[PDB]
Each structure stands twice: as structure tokens, then as C-alpha cells.
Design a protein around this ligand. Structure first.
Ligand SMILES: Nc1nc2c(ncn2[C@@H]2O[C@H](COP(=O)(O)O)[C@@H](O)[C@H]2O)c(=O)[nH]1
Ligand SMILES: *[C@@H]1O[C@H](CO)[C@@H](O)[C@H](O)[C@H]1NC(C)=O
Length: 246
């Protein structure tokens, strides 16, 4: 299990959390020096538990599928909550079995459904360490509309930061002040599956992508990533989604 405390949190302690999160995900192989997540893991070993503590010291435990870094559900006091999707239902067979009750959220965990439930796109939801503290607080007490927004914050500040160093750094910049995600941040999130695939295909193709991946740079301009020498590959992406899961 991996842990993060918002009480006394700073950029360094957050960086240590994201390092721990990445380090927990199992892999046998690296592709261009980037850990390749496993095709599958059977049983309870599929799920990583993250213990998160808000500034007041209250906690949730979040279940993460170690093959795809997807959040499946979370435990808050004696109640578990899982996304309304088959992978989460399966997870609920293995984690938080001790919960007194299990609530299925009224949405799946994909960004599109969460944004609909929340009433707002990610572009307009501030992220940062204060926002993460707030998200943990929200998730302690069931409100499905508020939780959707909280879960968009939680997913970006854990999973997406684990996937991309750039996103980790963006959250570190927002240690004491929230700010809506940069356009480049959104682009990277949206491209993780595509990049993961092309980096794997590039082995066998001299490091050249079969199909370019289009991103937005931090300044605002659209760029094409065509091969493994790109900074996105050498110095940003930290985890690859297995092509078996794409
Ligand atoms: N269940 C779940 N879906 C997620 C999570 N984080 C991001 N998503 C996103 O929702 C988008 C579409 O995912 P898909 O529904 O195609 O698997 C992707 O960006 C995917 O990564 C998460 O933590 N849990
Ligand atoms: C490889 O990527 C680099 C960095 O963007 C670029 O300058 C170069 O043109 C690319 N080469 C090929 C063959 O795609």
C-alpha cells in the first residue's frame, strides 16, 4: 500500500507519494526505459490500495487496478463506493469486503461520464494539493454530484501524475494554490493510451511510431510526436499501458 498525507504536504512529499505509487505497480519489462504495465493480474493482486489523509487526518482508501492505473472505488469509514462498470464490480469481489455497505456510484469512471455527472469539463475544475484535500473531504460523505468532481480531481492528482512527470510537476506547482489543468495536461491525459501503444509499436520499427500522436504543448501549440526521441517519451511518460489492454 502507498500513502499520502495532506497535513504538512509539500512538493517534495507529494513527489515521494507519486514515486511510491509508480514503484508499486508491477512490471517485468521496460520499453525504451519505461515500465510496461502487465497484461493482466488475477485475484486480489490486481489492486493497489492508496491511503489518503486530508488535512484533518480523515482517510479514504482508494483501489487502483495495477494494469491500467484506473481507480476502481474507494472506502470511506465503513462504506465502499465503486464505479458503475464491470471492472469495478469485479474489483468489489476482492477489496473492501469488510465494508458495512457498498454503494455503486451512478456513473462509470471515464472522463466523459464523470464530467457529465459533475456538470463541468475538467478544463474548468481547479486541481492541486488543496483541491485534493477537498476531494478527500467530499468523498467522505456521499453526494454523487459532488463526488464526480472530486473523483476528476483525485484521478488527475494520483493516476495521471503517476503516468506523466509533466502532470506531477503541474500538481507540485499547485501545492498551495489550485489552478485548472494546462491544455497540455489535458492533452497528455487524453493521449496516454495512444502514446503507450505507439511506443510499444516503435520497438520493431526503429523507434518510429506507426501513427503519429498529436499533443498540445504547455504554451498552447499543437505538436506531432512521431518517434521515441521526443521529450514526451524520453522525459515525461513514466508508465505504459500494455497493448494487450488497448
Ligand atoms: N475507471 C477509471 N477511468 C479513468 C480513470 N482515469 C482516467 N479514466 C479515463 O477515461 C478516459 C476513457 O477511458 P475508457 O473509458 O476509454 O477506458 C481515459 O482518459 C481514461 O484513462 C480512472 O481512474 N478510473
Ligand atoms: C523524430 O523526432 C524528432 C523530435 O521531434 C524529430 O525532430 C524528427 O524529425 C523525428 N524523426 C522521424 C524520422 O520521425
Amino acid at each position: 500500500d502507498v500513502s499520502f498525507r495532506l497535513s504538512g504536504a509539500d512538493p517534495s512529499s507529494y513527489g515521494m507519494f507519486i514515486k511510491d505509487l509508480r514503484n508499486a505497480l508491477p512490471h517485468t519489462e521496460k520499453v525504451y526505459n519505461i515500465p510496461l504495465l502487465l497484461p493482466s493480474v488475477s485475484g486480489a493482486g490486481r489492486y493497489l490500495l492508496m491511503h489518503l489523509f486530508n488535512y484533518d487526518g480523515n482517510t479514504i482508501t482508494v483501489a487502483v487496478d495495477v494494469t491500467n492505473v484506473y481507480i476502481m472505488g474507494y472506502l470511506a469509514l465503513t462504506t465502499s463506493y465503486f464505479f458503475n462498470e464491470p471492472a469495478a464490480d469485479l474489483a468489489s469481489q476482492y477489496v473492501f469486503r469488510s465494508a458495512r455497505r457498498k454503494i455503486t456510484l451512478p456513473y462509470s469512471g471515464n472522463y466523459e461520464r464523470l464530467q457529465i455527472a459533475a456538470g463541468k469539463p475538467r478544463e474548468k475544475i481547479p486541481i492541486g494539493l488543496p483541491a485534493l484535500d477537498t476531494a478527500i473531504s467530499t468523498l467522505l460523505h456521499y453526494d454523487s454530484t459532488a463526488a464526480a468532481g472530486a473523483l476528476l480531481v483525485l484521478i488527475q492528482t494520483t493516476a495521471e501524475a503517476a503516468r506523466f512527470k509533466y502532470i506531477e510537476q503541474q500538481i507540485q506547482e499547485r501545492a498551495y494554490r489550485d489552478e485548472v489543468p494546462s491544455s497540455a495536461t489535458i492533452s497528455l491525459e487524453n493521449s496516454w493510451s495512444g502514446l503507450s501503444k505507439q511506443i510499444q509499436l516503435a520497438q520493431g520499427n526503429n523507434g518510429v511510431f506507426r501513427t503519429p500522436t498529436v499533443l498540445v504543448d504547455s504554451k498552447g501549440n499543437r505538436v506531432q510526436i512521431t518517434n521515441v526521441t521526443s521529450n514526451v517519451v524520453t522525459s515525461n511518460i513514466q508508465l505504459l499501458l500494455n497493448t494487450k489492454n488497448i
